[model samples]
Target: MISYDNYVTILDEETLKAWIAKLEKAPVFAFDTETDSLDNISANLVGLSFAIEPGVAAYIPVAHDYLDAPDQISRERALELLKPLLEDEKALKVGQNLKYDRGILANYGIELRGIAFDTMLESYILNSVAGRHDMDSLAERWLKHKTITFEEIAGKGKNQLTFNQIALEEAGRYAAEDADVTLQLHLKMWPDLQKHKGPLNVFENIEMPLVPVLSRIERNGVKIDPKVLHNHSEELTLRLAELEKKAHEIAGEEFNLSSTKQLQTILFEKQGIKPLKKTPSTSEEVLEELALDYPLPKVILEYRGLAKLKSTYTDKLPLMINPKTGRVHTSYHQAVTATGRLSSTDPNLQNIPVRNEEGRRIRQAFIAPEDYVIVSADYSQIELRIMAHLSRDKGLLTAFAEGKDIHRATAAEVFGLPLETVTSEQRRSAKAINFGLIYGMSAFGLARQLNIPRKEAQKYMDLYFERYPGVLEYMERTRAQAKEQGYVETLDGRRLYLPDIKSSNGARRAAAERAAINAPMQGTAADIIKRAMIAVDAWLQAEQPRVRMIMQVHDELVFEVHKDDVDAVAKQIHQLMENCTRLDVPLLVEVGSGENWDQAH
Candidate 1:
């Protein structure tokens, strides 16, 4: 708990002036805003807090309206006094997840600048797997101080109070403590981050700069076509009904296709199909395995996929469109994933299916505005290229260098056939093997995936290792490195700690080993994209182009480009992405544009 003696409430211009003077002199200070809502785009600032020294902070209440609330400084006056320091590029500031605060301030027409440090990112970069990066957890973990939970001051449940509704005595303490804790947390984590080159470089070069870039992307949300989604939703409903009817007919009875209990009885008891394993499970994987032989399971699988697309995409996306902006804004999380990749929430765009027609139709709803075209610039075979670079495999490198169809090249090498003579089926198997190796798939796993005998799968695996000895050796070396160091490093020095690498449990150890092999490739890909984003954002800022980067899925960037500027912008985006990083083989970007997203792809 704060002493409350040093946690002064700034109601008049005099105290705020003194605090701002001290904050301005300090090289770095922690700042936070007390807001009415969690939605950065829509939240109203209740107050502001700043801390230049540990155990000392001040809260400037602005626009706090509650019954019998004390008169606080006017929002306009407070902002007028605070705007210069907050926007000063030379005056560095720290916060816990400054992106949220940045977004909130942006709503008030304050483009928050000079974001030097974030306690959340600091903790995450130091050791992502250590624990939660939230300020409450960071306070407990680093400072051994339990923070005043928001629930404590604001009450609980439906009767909970906003920061503005809370009494100044309580709200001031909570807000002031936040700024103080952030400063203290930074002091503790910053030195530790500096001791390591990898995390520090990742923090400085990648994560820090990308915060504003992501904030800008979130604000410039994708404009989705509700009519297109409505049409897709209707089509999906029809398809789901047809699939349900087919499944019922195949079962010779009616049952809920979504019910696991019903599916198990239909497949195992009614249909007399033996369970694949001891456990009578009706999971997607089990159904997929049964899909090889059973008509009901195939229909059920298709139904499940379409049902998900309809509910998660077609039905939900249109509803998610911001009423004011008329666009869907996804929250991009930087520190959530262990491998440094950014994951989005509120209708996750990343998990949208790419291979199926139904899924592609959903992309059609993500349309361009008038006089604009949706341009998707994707890194072709990015992970494979990263693997080639990391493995230094002669065959993989040569294939990429020659711009050969990597799957065909692999099939030729593995099946002892010339590239031209390799059949499509052979190429498909090679594609599976190529991707499967990156994930450390075994012969049994390969057999299950390809529906071949274990012996033949093992033969194919042996042939792959024989032809690409460097990749095999690289995998082995990575495992050993992870075991010794207890972590793996991406190409750009972001570390993913595998705590279970040395576990006595065989399954956990094996999983960690597989992760160790894959994490570097995945993390490096994430790092490269972040670099590309930073570079592109820099260009966007400097050039002020008629283009906006709307979305970034795995290895791809979608831009809403003015039709007149599409050629120039697309070429520049392609060049920017490719030249963002250099690998063993060329980093290739496939650029295309159309009226909608799928057509661009």
Candidate 2:
């Protein structure tokens, strides 16, 4: 076994090539890369590090003085040699949040396809409510030592030398240590995965495979129209300014609309808008109350509207568009949430405000590349399908199997009304109840969102449980499991830890109880979609189709396809998604295609 402790820089191309060639023969090696920016598309490769067992390791500085010479040529050649090992199905590819490493490498036209392991993912599945998932967090949790920051090695700010510009010896040591730390982290967490068998299996089988899949998806990022985004940004700026001015006029004075503290003062102190009695201390009580009172004081109402326009639509949405592609590319972090559901950032594609016309307009900004079209495939009633399967509710199963609108049927059942008399308004209310029940939402939450009385909301929930006792039973059982084990797993074994399920604080305990109720439902849906993605990815590789999986929101998958194969790809995607998981009820996927995501869905 080669030792990683001895770190040295080689000035000569021949020596460096010889070192990399020898290191490539190891059965297991640690790897990492330094990049120029966190979110920029055209970020430069700073360096690549490899730690081969014990004290042996090497760092290839891609930005070095001689990088343009034989050094670049040698590194490229070395990368070719390492590719097979990194992509080998048998070799264990380990890293802290290896998903990001895979993403960065994919940028360099490298695909990390192998038997992958992520310490971050493992740690999360094993102890989901533990400290943060950063390397320093891991080190402190397991190693009781802090890893060195980038600032420590390369000096602070953009003034510091790029990874390549650093002296060879220093770069080698710094880069190699990253790999070593990751390997150490692997040693610390791998055993825990086995100890926590349920989530461990899920991590190993489901989420781990997704690291490479996500790498490919991110690499083949959705094409963007910069001109469109820029135009939208300009238009939004003008609209936001106008809204702000109008809001000030309504308030009878100008104030900082962006400041939450100022808005709080205006609403609560100045306007004396007392919140509802049922408002939990932990809930966004003020906002909920404001949303409840429709005809609020003019100033408070205007402030609320302006706040949504600015933060949810105008200011933040534009920043989400990738400068390189002009389309928003959200990085899906796999390990952040205790539940199996993916979290998106850099534009938060999952939470695109869709309730208003203004928010819907923002969707128009996501246009297809000049010659290509966007195709979206979304699971239809995925959570309901999961619920039906888990609950074995014959009525719900039949409703989905017969292709009837489950929400409408729910309206009929919950309101004790005939199916024909279940108006769209009743269906809408029933839909909210269905979703809220799955999320463990309270009568107060339902009342606030729907602008109904709390007693009416309570009646709706009671009627829902009366109609589908199986769902209530399933929810109760899941909550019991969470209380007993401090965690719960989906049908596919994806684990979600509920630490606060045992909390002494009433609100925290209640929230955790709600999570316990919801995790299995939402987490199962997440699992099903992820399974569909894997199936779709495998199908593409087998068929060698021109279509590529580019992006994945919770229930949606976006594909960039060659024009000729769009229909074929869409058919295959829809079929695969429907069959990815077998529930008692039929799984359905709604497939749409157009020039952009907005049009496709």
Candidate 3:
């Protein structure tokens, strides 16, 4: 009953209600939201788009103008209408990256509960190596069409008009296209996924269920100490300035500290040092090399040193603090990485300065609120545990089962020394080998980290395999299976297809071989934690607990607990996370609690 050619408008509540009532019985529906700012955490929702059945689509304008309109329904009614559709366990609700949509919805006091299918997550799981996950990419590949971009109609600069002020027809068309495209993507990918025995099944069964759980977690964001963050920011500024002065002193000349081109002219052109392979090609080293070979001056070397200090450490620190929270709030993306590990962005909390004194100081800013505590629950050596489980090597499994230091055990075996006699240096070298081998690391890679000759690194790796033949066998089998079948899977049947596993190119093939070795171990680890999050969320809700899950950074989960129940909640979380998944290696969880994340860790 919907016409394709008509200019559709969805502004009035009465018309929206009528459409919702009529389209309620559709088997599948598509939904999306448009927000004002791309950067702000609290960006207001401008429009809501939905397509019921197939061609039928609508967009509800909800911005500043509509906020003042009399036709606007009460929040309770909005909840009532949306809750049943979203929470319906049997209904299919499709969207592109529904997680972000859920985030936007949560800001409006809406919890998206029942998600029978998710096109974006499914596509990512099915083709983990494909790299692109945008709706436009999927649409082009599958639907063979391009939807309107915001820039096309809204013009160049940021438009000041609210959603309601925009012409109703334009808003409806834009929103409708999003809904339509998402649905089309679902249609195109779903069948292919089923046929390929893809990881989409795991995404649907395990990962999708966790979307609402994450929604709740993010909604219950941990409290931050504004004063501590401000103090940290100020301290960082002072430290950065000091570092800059030191760098300039080392360089022995004054030049533009921030310009890469200028630094390159100074370093490579003036200084005549042969550049290392690892040095960035476009960097001062390359410029220095060129300049030195062709009669350049000597001050370039100092410029390189100064530039490295400023660019790598000093200049980037202050901007990491979140403006809203004062404390940094890294947005933990669930499905960005092909390896299945969660990735952090915005402030990039995952890569916080941890090695040096100045870097370590950044942690001081992440303070907890007055009454609540920041509790960190981390899985100790999870990937190693996964490797032990998958390989079922007696030495590794026994080491884990006996609760012995696995890295120390590896050190002893590799160095042919007694467990107690294994030197700290040996253990550190063994630790790198232990983690690196799982990813099919080469001797060259290990040698770079250990500062040893490639031959020595190779010798260490060879000894490791000899000591634990089962790990080698598992690694071999994983690569073989991936090459033969063009895909790998976790225990839960989460498939990761490697199209280039059998590629003719040696380097590309080698990379695929490494992915094949790692997919199951890393993928399974991801599966365990995701399941744990769901279980923990459910337990919290069932107990009617005030403690809330705020963030998950890879193996670590940060919680904001109520003042009175902090102790009880901490115990509950520790137990649940440790028991989340059982692998061949013992799953060890270490729990730390304090007034803030820094204190907790």
Query: Which model scores highest in TM-score?
Result: 1
**Stretch of 10 with least lDDT, candidate 1:** 275-284
List residue ranges in candidate 1 displaced over 4 A. 258-260, 264-272, 276-286, 289-294, 583-585
For model 2, the superposed segments whose C-alpha errors exceed 4 Å read 1-6, 10-25, 36-41, 66-73, 80-84, 107-109, 230-328, 582-585
Candidate 3 on 365-427: residue-level lDDT in tens?
A: 455666767778888888898898888888988888888899999998888889988888999
The positional error of residue 503 in candidate 3, measured at the CA in angstroms, is 2.6
Q: How well does candidate 2 score on lDDT at residue 584?
A: 39
Task: Residues 1-601, candidate 2: write the lDDT tens digits.
Answer: 1123456545456766676666557566677777666653566666677776745666776556634432443456656655766666666567777777777766667767664777787777776668688777887788876776777667877587556566666666677777877777887777767875677767877788777777667656666555565666676667667766765665557776533445555566656555532314334445545554532334344445545655664566565566675556667777777677778776577766556655555666566665667888988878877888788788788888788889998998988788878998899999988888778889889887676888899988888888999988988888898989888778877777788898999999999999887878888888787788788988887898878787787688888777778888888898888876544336788999887777787
TM-score of 3: 0.84
Clash count (model 1, backbone only): 0
TM-score, prediction 1 = 0.96
Ranking by TM-score: 1, 2, 3
lDDT of each: 0.88, 0.72, 0.69
User: Regarding TM-score, does 2 or 3 come out ahead?
Assistant: 2
Better of 1 and 2 by lDDT: 1
Higher-TM-score candidate among 1 and 3? 1
